[PDB]
């Protein structure tokens, strides 16, 4: 799941 991967980074600073 890349949507998981970049969405998580998107809500980390």
């Amino acid at each position, epitope marked *: *799941s890349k*949507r*998981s991967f970049i*969405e*998580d980074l*998107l*809500f*980390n*600073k």
Partner: antibody
Amino acid sequence: VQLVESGGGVVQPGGSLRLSCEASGFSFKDYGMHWIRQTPGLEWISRISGDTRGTSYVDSVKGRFIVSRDNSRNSLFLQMNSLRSEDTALYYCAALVIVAAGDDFDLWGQGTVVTVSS
Amino acid sequence: ALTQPLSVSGSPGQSVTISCTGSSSDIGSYNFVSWYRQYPGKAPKVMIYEVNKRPSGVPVRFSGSKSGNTASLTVSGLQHEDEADYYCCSYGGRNNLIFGGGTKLTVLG
């Protein structure tokens, strides 16, 4: 494919509610989940990652609300403590496509009304 | 924190556009703009996301675009089933989501 909410109602200022979102039809553990409340418009409140590791809050609810999920039961929660009048709204849970990365899944529950009133 | 006009209208078959104004650190900085349609007594459904992308199932007349700090939803060839409230959404700039205030699209009859 469905998200089924409950846990709202009439609560007194300072009170506590625990909102529930129950997920069926899809791989729950693989989606960020949010809480969005609606008043006259929509206001984003909170987000939890699929793997539960990371949470966000809008500032007005920081300290007072806590998002949590239970992937083993496809459940999303919003423990609301220390409620204020300003918290009165229709609260949605939702999986939102903000970055699709090939996956345009987007799903909201039916809402649950929270009214903060003595 | 995302501004939409209060309401917009048009007749069956016309084209209407709904603007959505943010700041530079949000709409101006990411391509994470989505739109949601909401019918009376129902939950929002996504019409557009990533500024101009449409999920299959959403009619081809729905299109999204972005210029500077302002996103837009256009609805070509209007239909009565398109009457609803439409909310824009953007990534907010710091681990964050912001929504617009809503716009009431009336298909006049």
